[PDB]
Amino acid sequence: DDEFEEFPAEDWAGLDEDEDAHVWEDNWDDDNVEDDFSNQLRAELEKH
Amino acid sequence: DLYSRYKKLQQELEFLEVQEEYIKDEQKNLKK
Amino acid sequence: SGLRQYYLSKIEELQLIVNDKSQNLRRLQAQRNE
Amino acid sequence: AAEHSQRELDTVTLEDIKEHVKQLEKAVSGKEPRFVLRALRMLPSTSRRLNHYVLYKAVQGFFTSNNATRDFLLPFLEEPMDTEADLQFRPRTGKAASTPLLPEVEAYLQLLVVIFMMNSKRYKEAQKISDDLMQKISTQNRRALDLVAAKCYYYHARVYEFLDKLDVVRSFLHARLRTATLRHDADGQATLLNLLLRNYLHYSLYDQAEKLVSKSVFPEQANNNEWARYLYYTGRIKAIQLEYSEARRTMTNALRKAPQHTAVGFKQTVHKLLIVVELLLGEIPDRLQFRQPSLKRSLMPYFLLTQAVRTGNLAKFNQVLDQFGEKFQADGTYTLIIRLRHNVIKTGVRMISLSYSRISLADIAQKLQLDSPEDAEFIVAKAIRDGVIEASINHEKGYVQSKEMIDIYSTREPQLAFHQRISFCLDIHNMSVKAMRFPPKS
Amino acid sequence: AATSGAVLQAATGMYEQLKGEWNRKSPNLSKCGEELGRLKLVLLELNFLPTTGTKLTKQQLILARDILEIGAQWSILRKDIPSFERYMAQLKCYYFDYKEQLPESAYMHQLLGLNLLFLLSQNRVAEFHTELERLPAKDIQTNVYIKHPVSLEQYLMEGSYNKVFLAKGNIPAESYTFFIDILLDTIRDEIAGCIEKAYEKILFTEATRILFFNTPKKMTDYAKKRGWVLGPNNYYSFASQQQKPEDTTIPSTELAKQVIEYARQLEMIV
Amino acid sequence: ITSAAGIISLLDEDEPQLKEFALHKLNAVVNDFWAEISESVDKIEVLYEDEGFRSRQFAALVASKVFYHLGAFEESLNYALGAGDLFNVNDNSEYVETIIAKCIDHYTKQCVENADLPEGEKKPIDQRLEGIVNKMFQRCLDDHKYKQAIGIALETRRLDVFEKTILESNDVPGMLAYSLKLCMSLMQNK
């Protein structure tokens, strides 16, 4: 082993507990804040 | 003394090369 | 004291080469004997 | 109660140390320098499990001859607290005790002592012992001694860095690197190059680091850890300069070559730099790395930065920068983030090019929330020249048309890739056959 | 020593003469040039460039720093890029490497900003950023003399060339005016290169409009300088085809050599 | 300390006193800035080429030092030869030792190549290289280690220095026996 002592491990000062820790798949698009695709389709039908 | 050691090492290296070539040829022919 | 470092450097280079060659030759000899 | 457990642990550690010196002696006797690496492998574990009794017993048992080094070393060590069950560990027997120990063994014991002194928060004596060891190494000249001197160099630089005197050791490192290069020592070359690059980067002498990298050829037969360090530092240099593509390539290689389990901090640092350089290039880093348990909390600010970059919003970007301003400075990426804060639009143009085969400049302006389409045209031209997007502009109609995708297979490129990999595999087989040993004739 | 003190006195006397020659309402230019030409040689004996920290005469260090400062400003006022580079090479050393004991001047940040702008004008963005890294963090976000080159570089990266073309008017100190012109010429050249590599058969609502040429004929000389065909008016084909290399010859000798090497490695006794 | 850029800058200024100051400072700080000097080494090359200069030897020495640091040992040897007496053969420094070894090897190879040729086509040998090798021979003789001098004499085909070393010694008969053993031992060229 060649433990890289020169580079320190990130400090655990705060070390806040996991918010949700859900383990499904993450994925980027989940971050998006959409507007209720149902409402989107209703608006699309209304505006034709 | 140092000259003798240096030249002896040179001769040893040449002999090792000769032996290496001979052994490779011997292996190739032993396959046949 | 005079031209000793030069001789020693050449001898050390030759010794390293000879050690490597001897190791390779021993491996080859083992295979040949098999 | 734990005293007996500590004593038996010390005894087993002494047995391990004796095995290590036996291995070094066997290496020297057999003219197989690579053997000493087996003993050097356990350096971290041995350092972790070292103790005062261990060090004192080891030095007493291993320095019967040439007691000058015992005189220089023992005073630093603490005398055993009225030990009464001392076994007077005597590894060297009779002729072995009388004869002067080997230079490699003396260097190894000195290295153990300096590591212990460093682990303890006592750096002055660590520096003194280190300087003595380096004088011994400079005086001596052997192969296995050079292999040990590699780690000796590493810890000497470490103690000086702790002292905050990294500048003064620069000339020492340069001199030793020159000697190693003349003597054809790959391990020493690698260790000294990595330490010198670390020295330069600490003070931000990026021009000096770049010049040294350009003029020195890293050894190919270097340990994977040294390769990882070198790749990280070269990627850092290229990223600070404007070579983002090469930086990303080199740093992906560095992270790939880093040890799988350990080196957590190195992984965090390389990951942060990779995130920033990818954002600068305009791509989007993979989200899998953002949830690994080890790299989870550290990379949260960079996660938010990537979020803002993807959903480009200067308000969110400035909020994130203002919040985690100090941590970026601490970690060494604030300047790169500042560059990203103004080259953010590159990512939007990349997404537009990826999605649309032919779009109007007015539509590009609308999508990128820019001013009149002239600014969009200038941005697109800049991107095309930079090579971010393979597209051609046409203002006689006023739209950007993406280039076609060429049939890569019909080209000779697959042949080149496969030839590279075939040569690599053949070299692997040849070296794996040469590594074989048949020992019965010994 | 008495001789050391006397020669220090001579050097400071020449420096005071230069101060009188320059800091008036209008420098003599040539007179200050001769003064600096002799003061360069004069400086040699007062340890011009300490090869080691070895804290030496603070008076010598300050005198050398000031002389090189005035020399760099003289070069900029005389319109001599080589002289400016030669003076800055040493001024940077004095500012960065001996400052551990020597105090911090009042022109340090202005001269560093001058250097950054000079690098940007010569289009050495790599060196620009390498140097920008040396300076502290707060000074790159506070000092008005260091903030002009940074803003110009950021706009150049963003591609908003219009912003800089209008921001030329604002200058922290008149010295920057010289280098702003070379920066504008270089930015015009970069726009031309971007248009050439990108685009296909000119347009961009006429080349003059996007190249920011006041008169229609002002771009003709640069069009002639570059290898542009000069087709219809404001219509220069860039030949982005690059000859469209389509000829393929099946490199055969090299492939045969590669396969023969494969066979050699497969058959030879390792 | 650091940078080492102004010293290089002060080399194109047409004043052969600032030029010499810069050359001396570069010689002082060459072991720690060889990479920086290497990019501009052509300036020192042109300085050496210029005969009008006065510190031609010093320019040659500094250029040779930077080239030796780089790895271009042939160029370093050539410039060390041109550097004249400023190369102090009797100096215990790594640069001195490595360049001395390079000159010895170069002379050995050239002499061996020349030996097996007619006198008409004998390729010329640089007199500076000859002088360096002769100085090393003299150092051997002064230190009294005659066997090393004999060895290098035989290797370089210098029968003259071989004879001189045999005669000027304390054990003439012993040296004769040693040389005869070398001849009727590993010495193959008939």
Distance CA D187, CA D33 (A): 12
The span from the CA of E163 to the CA of E169, in Å, is 11
Within 10 A of D249 (CB to CB), how many other CB atoms are there?
A: 14
Contact D212, D249 (CB under 8 A): no
Q: Give the DSSP letter string of D265-333.
A: HHHHHHHHHHHHHHHHHT----SGGGS-STTTTTTHHHHHHHHHHHT--HHHHHHHHHHTHHHHHHHT-
Same domain as D413, residue D340:
no
On whether the CB atoms of residues D267 and D294 are closer than 8 A, the answer is yes
Q: Which residues of D touch E162 (CB under 8 A)?
A: 374-375, 378
Query: How many C-beta atoms surround the C-beta of residue E197 within 10 A?
Result: 15
Q: Which letter does DSSP use for residue A11 in this model?
A: P
Cα angle A44-D399-A29, degrees, rounded to a multiple of 5: 45
Asked if C4 and B2 come within 8 Å (Cβ–Cβ), the reply is yes
Q: CA-nearest residue of chain D to F102?
A: D182
E66 and E15 in contact (C-beta within 8 Å)? yes
- Give residue D371's region: left, alpha or beta (phi > 0; psi -120 to 50): beta
**Residue D52's closest CA among D147, D117, D135?**
D117
Closest CA to D240 of E131, E255, E235, E242: E131
Q: What is the DSSP letter of E230?
A: -
In a shared domain, residues D339 and D412: no
Degrees, nearest 5: CA angle D401-D402-D404: 125
Q: How many residues are listed for chain E in this entry?
A: 270
Kindly state the tokens that stand for F180: 């005869």
CA distance F128 to F111: 14
H or E stretch at E37: helix E30-43
Q: Which residue shows structure tokens 């020593």?
A: E1
Among candidates B1, C5, C2, which has minimal Cα distance to F143? C2
d(CA D110, CA D103): 10
Alpha-carbon distance of E84 to E74, in angstroms, equals 8
For residue D138 the two structure tokens come to: 């400079």
> For residues E50 and E66, what is the distance between their CA atoms, to the nearest angstrom?
16
Size of interface D-E (CB pairs under 8 A): 92
Q: Nearest residue on chain D to E161, judged by CA atoms?
A: D378
Q: Is D167 helix (H, G, I), strand (E, B) or coil?
A: coil
Per the structure block, which two tokens stand in for D264? 């957590």
CA atoms within 13 A on the CB side of D430: 14
**AA letter at F179:** S
Three-state SS string over chain F comes to CCCCCHHHHCCCCCCCCHHHHHHHHHHHCCCCCHHHHHHHHHHHHHHHHCCCCCCHHHHHHHHHHHHHHHCCHHHHHHHHHHCHHHCCCCCCCHHHHHHHHHHHHHHHHHHHHHHCCCCCCCCCCCHHHHHHHHHHHHHHHHHCCHHHHHHHHHHHCCHHHHHHHHHCCCCHHHHHHHHHHHHCCCCCCC
Cα separation of E125 and E118, whole Å? 10
Rounded Cα distance, F143 and F17, in Å: 40
Spatial separation of the C-alpha atoms in residues F145 and F152, rounded to whole Å: 12
CA distance D255 to D253: 6
Domain limits at D282? 232-361
DSSP strand pairing (D391-394 vs D399-402): antiparallel
Contact (Cβ atoms closer than 8 angstroms) between residue E126 and residue D241: yes
**If 0-12 CB within 10 Å is exposed, 13-18 middle and 19+ buried, where does residue D251 land?**
buried
Q: What angle do CA D194, D198, D202 make, to 5 degrees?
A: 175
Q: What CA–CA distance (Å, rounded) separates D50 from D44?
A: 10
C3 part of contact set with chain F, CB < 8 Å: yes
Count: domains in chain E: 1
Q: Does A27 touch chain D (CB under 8 A)?
A: yes
Do D298 and D409 sit in the same domain of this protein?
no
- Residue B24: CB atoms within 10 Å: 16
Other Cβ atoms within 10 Å of D178 Cβ, number: 18
Classify residue D104 by burial, with Cβ atoms within 10 Å: 0-12, 13-18, 19+. Answer: buried
Query: What does the alpha-carbon distance between residue F2 and residue D194 come to, in Å, rounded to a whole number?
Result: 18
Q: Is-contact C18 B13, C-beta < 8 A?
A: yes
* Alpha carbon distance D354, D351 (integer Å): 5
Structural tokens at position F11: 């080399």
Q: Give me the helix-helix angle, D206-215 and F34-49, nearest 10°.
A: 70
In whole angstroms, what is the distance from residue D71 CA to residue D76 CA? 10
Nearest to D371, CA basis, from E206, E162, E187? E162
Burial zone of C25 (CB within 10 Å; 0-12 exposed, 13-18 middle, 19+ buried): middle
Q: What does the alpha-carbon distance between residue D65 and residue D105 come to, in Å, rounded to a whole number?
A: 12
The answer to whether residues F128 and F135 touch, using CB atoms and an 8 Å cutoff, is no
Chains C and D touch (3+ CB pairs under 8 A): yes
Contacts of F105 (CB under 8 A, 6+ apart): none
The CA-to-CA distance between both ends of chain C, in Å, stands at 50
Which strands form D358-360's sheet, in the order they lie side by side?
D358-360, D399-402, D391-394
F186 touches chain B (CB under 8 A): yes
| D333 and D247 together in one domain | yes
Torsion angle, CA of D367/D369/D370/D371, rounded to 10 degrees?
110
Cα torsion for E55, E60, E61, E63, to the nearest 10°?
170
Q: Are D171 and D132 in contact (CB under 8 A)?
A: no
Do C and F make contact via 3 or more CB pairs under 8 A? The reply is: yes
HEC profile of D68-106: HHHHHHCCCCCCCCCCCCCCCCCCCCCHHHHCCCCHHHH
CB atoms under 10 Å from CB of E214, counted, come to 6
For residues D312 and D427, membership in a common domain is answered with no
Residue F182's contacts (CB-CB under 8 Å, 6 or more residues apart) are: B3, B4, F150, F154
Burial class (CB in 10 A: 0-12, 13-18, 19+), E242: exposed
Q: Which residue's entry shows tokens 């010689």?
A: F27
C-to-N gaps above 2.5 Å in chain F, after residues: none
Cα separation, D246 vs D248, in Å, equals 5
Tokens, residue D45: 């574990």
Contact predicate E175/E77, CB 8 Å: yes
Identify whether residues D351 and D236 lie together within a single domain: yes
Helix (H, G, I), strand (E, B) or coil at E229: coil
Give CA–CA dist E21/C30, Å, rounded.
88
The answer to whether the CB of D400 falls within 8 A of the CB of D363 is no
Sign of CA dihedral F69, F75, F81, F82: negative
**Distance between CA atoms of F138 and F158, rounded to whole angstroms?**
13
CA distance E190 to E185: 9
Residue D147, both tokens: 């292999």
Q: Which chains touch F (3 or more CB pairs under 8 A)?
A: B, C, D, E
Exposure string of D409-426, with b = 16+ CB inside 10 Å and e = fewer, is eeeeeeeeeebeeeeeeb
Classify E97 as helix, strand or coil.
Answer: coil
DSSP E218: G
D360 beta partners = D399
Q: Closest CB to F145: pick one of C2, C5, C9.
A: C2
Spell out which residues of chain F touch residue D170, defining contact as CB-CB under 8 Å. 32
Which of F7, F29, F34 is the best mutation test for D, with the most CBs of D within 10 A? F34
> Is-contact C9 B9, C-beta < 8 A?
no
Residues 6 or more apart whose Cβ sits within 8 Å of residue B5: C11
E strand or H helix at D402: strand D399-402
What length is written for chain F?
A: 190
Q: How many angstroms separate the CA atoms of E14 and E4, rounded?
A: 15
8 Å CB contact between D329 and D302: no
H runs (alpha helix) in D102-205: 103-119, 123-139, 143-163, 169-183, 186-203
C18 at the B interface (CB within 8 A)?
Answer: yes
d(CA D223, CA D187): 8
- SS3 for B3-23 is HHHHHHHHHHHHHHHHHHHHH
> Which pairing describes strands D399-402 and D358-360: parallel, antiparallel, or unpaired?
antiparallel
Best of F105, F147, F187 to disrupt the B interface by mutation (most B CBs within 10 Å)?
A: F147
- CA of D440: how far to CAs of C26, D437, F132, in Å? 11, 9, 51
Q: How far is D279 from chain E (nearest CA, A)?
A: 15
Instruction: Provide the number of CB pairs (under 8 Å) joining chain C to chain D.
Output: 16
Long-range contact pairs involving D167-175 (C-beta distance under 8 Å, separation at least 24): D167/D199, D167/D203, D167/F1, D169/D199, D170/D196, D170/D199, D170/F32, D171/F31, D171/F32, D172/D134, D173/D199, D174/F31, D174/F32, D175/F31
C33–F contact, CB cutoff 8 A: no
- Residue D394 CB partners (closer than 8 Å, separation 6+): D400, D401, E199, E200, E201, E203
Q: Determine the Cα–Cα distance for residues D165 and E63; give it in Å rounded to an integer.
A: 29
Are both D408 and D354 inside the same structural domain?
no
Partner B contacted by F139 (CB < 8 A): no
Q: D432 and D326 in one domain?
A: no
Query: Domain residues for E245?
Result: 6-265
Is residue E270 situated within a structural domain? no
Alpha carbon separation from F49 to A11, D431, F86 (Å, rounded) = 59, 49, 17
Across the interface, whether the CB atoms of C27 and D32 are under 8 A apart is answered no
According to DSSP H, which parts of E143-175 are helical? 147-158, 161-167
Is E260 buried (19+), middle (13-18) or exposed (0-12) by CB count in 10 A? Answer: exposed
Closest CA to E83 of E97, E73, E92, E93: E73
Say which experimental method was used: cryo-EM
Cβ contact F–A (≥3 pairs, < 8 Å)? no
Q: Where are the domains of chain A?
A: 1-48
In a domain, E1, yes or no: no
